[PDB]
Design a protein around this nucleic acid. Sequence first.
DNA 1: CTAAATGCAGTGCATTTA
DNA 2: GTAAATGCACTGCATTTA
Lengths: 78, 72
Amino acid sequence: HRHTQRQIQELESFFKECPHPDDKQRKELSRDLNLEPLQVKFWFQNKRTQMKAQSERHENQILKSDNDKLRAENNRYK
Amino acid sequence: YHRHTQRQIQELESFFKECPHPDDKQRKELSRDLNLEPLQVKFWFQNKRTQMKAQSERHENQILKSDNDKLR
DNA sequence: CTAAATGCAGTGCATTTA
DNA sequence: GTAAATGCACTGCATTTA
């Protein structure tokens, strides 16, 4: 119900390299690490949602704090 | 797999307006009231919940984004 | 967050049908 | 003979279900 660490390493290793596979690209990976490609297909989409979601989350949790800290500076000036 | 009936989801969208964080008791009736496994019921809300914070902060994002840039 | 999966456009090319 | 259709894949993403 989850994937192998041996496996998942090579997943993330490829996505930094080639974050968008063709079918052909997808198939060969599976044969290398004993998985189904539609699985492989699915993951590659979900990793893409991951980067979208986190790039937003970090930013929001950050800018809220950054726009918060700057405001305190403005009042110390006034 | 198997998605959820429109009857289900419509009642969902209708109730989600009311108590977007519902307790076991009400979860228990709704689960029964709507031919559901309450885990499923418990689940969908968690996601339904999770979606909105993301959707809201994205608008929080885009609105805080255009304001800062346009000033320059 | 994961793992699995669906729904809807849209895109390209090869083959029918009109 | 040609142009428009249709059948078949694939892509890509956002959303849903557990």
